[PDB]
């Protein structure tokens, strides 16, 4: 099922509660009205639902799951990378 | 230094955080088997225990 | 390039028939009585047989399964007193 060489693309693993929390420690920076995009644990921002959005925050990242983006609306924003 | 029957690693293989590993049913099909239908409904996945130790291991590391 | 004769010599292979769950134990919607697969189970226990009487299996759930003639297909229900109101 494998290929005849290389190719490949990209993407990463970044999610809810995850942030809200450890991002609660992210408040040492854009953790106010929160313009996320750490820079501490991962590579290629993605947002996992599970949990309960919060810290009301706009996130400059790739994307996220259903609920998440939803919960998001719970009390925050959602900005996507480059062009979307 | 180490590698792994990368093979089997290819075909049939790949674990869950659970510390367990599985590969696709594997009755007959895909060769000889005019056989039947319902029998068809005979290819999902099969998780063999014990041995799945050589396996996992031998693979170990990346998978 | 063939085979010979006057040597009957012809071992036989394996089977695996049983009564699994025997009579009157914790009944589980699973292989009831066995001695003829493709079998067509029945309802509760069985008592019909080339013998006369019948057999109860003080164990009740969905159903069990037959063996084609032997034993004696089920039908004479018998959930068991252990099937009342909790």
């Amino acid at each position: 099922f494998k290929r005849p060489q290389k190719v490949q693309e990209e993407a990463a693993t970044i999610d809810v509660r995850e942030i809200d929390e450890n991002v609660t420690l992210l408040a040492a920076d854009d953790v106010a009205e929160d313009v996320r995009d750490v820079a501490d644990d991962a590579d290629y921002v993605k947002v996992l639902g599970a949990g309960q959005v919060r810290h009301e925050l706009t996130l400059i990242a790739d994307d996220f799951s259903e609920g998440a983006r939803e919960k998001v609306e719970g009390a925050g924003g959602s900005v996507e990378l480059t062009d979307l | 230094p180490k590698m792994k029957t990368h093979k089997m690693a290819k075909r049939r293989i790949k674990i869950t955080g659970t510390g367990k590993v599985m590969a696709f049913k594997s009755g007959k099909r895909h060769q000889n088997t005019g056989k039947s239908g319902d029998e068809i409904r005979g290819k999902g996945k099969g998780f063999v225990l014990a041995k799945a130790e050589w396996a996992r291991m031998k693979l170990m590391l990346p998978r | 390039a063939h085979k010979k004769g006057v040597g009957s010599s012809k071992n036989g292979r394996d089977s695996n028939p049983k009564y699994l769950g025997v009579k009157k134990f914790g009944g589980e919607v699973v292989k009831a009585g066995n001695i003829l697969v493709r079998q067509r189970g029945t309802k509760f226990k069985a008592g019909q047989g080339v013998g006369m009487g019948r057999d109860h299996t003080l164990f009740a759930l969905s159903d069990g399964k037959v063996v084609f003639i032997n034993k004696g297909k089920g039908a004479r229900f018998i959930s068991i007193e252990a099937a009342q109101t909790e």
Partner: protein, 53 residues
Amino acid sequence: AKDGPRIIVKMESSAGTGFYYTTTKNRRNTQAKLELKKYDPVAKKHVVFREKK
């Protein structure tokens, strides 16, 4: 399968197009170009079904 030009010959049957097919073993034995029956291709359901192949 064990392809044996012995009255033993494997074949299928389309679904008027319902699209694809479904398994079947056969025997010239009788009725040669004979072979019809209905089923249900990914195409809705049912559909006449010739077998010839």
